[PDB]
Design a binder for this molecule. Structure first.
Ligand code: HEM
Length: 467
């Protein structure tokens, strides 16, 4: 059947438009009151239908708020909602239980997370996205009132609030390392009806529980919901920059300046120039015109050369972040159902202040900043967990490579098996692809915690969650 976009929470398909976004992580302290309160929240919940209207209004221009809600397994238990058939071990077990296997640093095993993610019983998260702090703060006061926060009717307790902010000026839509984000998303069949060149279509059930392509009995209340993975990922920006500065690529002829060598290395760690121009299309120079053109900036698959050819890392290293997280032709030899199953929708936002002169000049992080990583999928095991653990953390992925090649770790998110995280990456020098680059002992991205949630449908919120 066609998708009913007025039944789907709007961060999942379309995504909540934003300059700032607050995540309000809560514990349910009064289940009966919470279910009554939730009836009054439902009219505030932004559906995909409303997002499409909102995006049409932004594209023609604005005070605009979007609201979604998601529940952890601990929250469903608290509400007495039987989730025996919801998701699989990952959602039921919670992210803290998965931290060791994700490769998160520990003093184990307990991960080195922020206390709120490590110590505390998170039952859910309310997402509030808006054009401004004023818009989000106003909407949060309304949502707090609905749940009685600050008064004797309270049904929830705040565990943690985290604010994200899109970066300023010409860095708008770039993450803190300086790279354009939000380019490549799967095209959901029945929603993204005009995929860009290179944008692979996926059956809706890769994203939405209970739809075509959802390879898992389901409870009726899970249809048209999606699993929300949250990770707070701290970024060490001066430390990343220091690594590029110390490791410029020198191509035959020694024509590149050290600055150009360091810039090229950055592009080859991610798979794109900071502009968003993909290196599989423009391997040795940026192309700002290409970077801005959605008909062109995703039209590659790592097929010329293909993975199995000698010296096949000429244009993009195997271990470049995007080639680890979306292998394209490195696996597209396998079934359309198999490769579509690994796709995620990303809806994160940067957090924290811009790098200060002192941080920049001293080359040392003083302030907490990074990515509030959010992704949606119908199956956490097939999406987020597989990408992190089978691909990013696997130095010998992909098997389509030549046998003598050891790609190494995703240099952005890749984590090694023991606290001794010695990480290497091959292929960064296109004319000496066997040469290993030792990554620093100190990670560039430091996980600070997160949780696995479920964003229900509107009808599920009305007919199952609310009272
Ligand atoms: C601070 C942490 C991270 C940074 C700085 C980062 C940065 C980026 C950048 C710059 C892009 C390229 C833009 C694009 O193609 O849309 C990208 C794409 C992507 N990232 Fe990340 N990322 C981070 C964490 C993660 C994590 C934890 C995952 C999954 C486990 C992930 C999965 C992806 C995927 C699937 C893509 C799209 C690949 C494609 O379709 O070509 N990223 N990321």
């Amino acid at each position: 059947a066609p998708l009913d976009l007025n039944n789907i929470q709007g961060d999942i398909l379309g995504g909540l438009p934003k300059k700032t976004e607050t995540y309000f992580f809560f514990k349910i302290t009064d289940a009966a009151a919470f279910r009554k309160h939730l009836k009054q929240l439902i009219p505030l919940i932004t559906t995909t239908a409303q997002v499409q209207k909102d995006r049409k209004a932004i594209d023609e221009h604005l005070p605009l708020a979007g609201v979604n809600i998601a529940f952890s397994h601990a929250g469903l238990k608290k509400l007495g909602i039987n989730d025996d058939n919801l998701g699989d071990t990952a959602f039921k077990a919670g992210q803290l239980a998965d931290a060791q296997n994700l490769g998160d640093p520990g003093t184990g095993f307990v991960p080195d997370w922020d206390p709120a993610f490590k110590e505390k019983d998170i039952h859910g998260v309310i997402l509030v996205a808006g054009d401004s702090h004023e818009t989000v703060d106003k909407k949060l006061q309304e949502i707090e009132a609905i749940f009685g926060v600050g008064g004797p009717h309270a049904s929830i307790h705040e565990v943690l609030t985290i604010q994200g902010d899109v970066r300023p000026g010409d860095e708008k839509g770039h993450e803190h390392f300086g790279f354009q984000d939000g380019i490549s998303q799967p095209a959901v069949k029945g929603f993204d009806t005009n995929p860009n060149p290179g944008q692979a279509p996926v059956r809706p059930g890769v994203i939405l529980v209970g739809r075509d392509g959802d390879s898992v009995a389901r409870p009726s209340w899970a249809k048209d919901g999606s699993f929300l993975v949250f990770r707070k990922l701290q970024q060490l920006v001066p430390e990343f920059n220091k690594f590029l500065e110390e490791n410029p690529i020198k191509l035959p002829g020694n024509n590149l300046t050290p600055e150009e060598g360091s810039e090229l290395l950055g592009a080859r760690l991610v798979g794109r120039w900071k502009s968003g121009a993909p290196i599989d299309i423009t391997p040795l120079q940026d192309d700002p015109e290409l970077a801005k053109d959605p008909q062109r900036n995703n039209n590659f698959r790592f097929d010329h050369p293909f993975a199995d050819e000698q010296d096949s890392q000429t244009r993009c290293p195997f271990a470049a972040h995007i080639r680890k997280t979306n292998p394209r032709a490195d696996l597209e030899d396998a079934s359309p159902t198999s490769v579509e199953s690994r796709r995620i929708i990303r809806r994160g936002i940067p957090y924290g202040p811009e790098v200060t002169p002192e941080e920049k000049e001293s080359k040392k992080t003083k302030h907490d900043r990074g990515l509030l990583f959010v992704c949606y999928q119908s199956n956490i095991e097939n999406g987020f967990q597989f990408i992190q653990k089978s691909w990013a953390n696997n130095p010998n992925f992909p098997p389509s490579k030549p046998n003598p090649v050891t790609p190494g770790f995703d240099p952005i998110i890749g984590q090694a098996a023991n606290n001794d995280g010695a990480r290497t990456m091959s292929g960064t020098d296109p004319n000496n692809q066997a040469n290993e680059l030792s990554l620093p002992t100190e990670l560039f991205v430091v996980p600070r915690g997160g949780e696995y949630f479920f964003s229900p449908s509107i009808s599920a919120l009305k007919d199952t969650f609310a009272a």
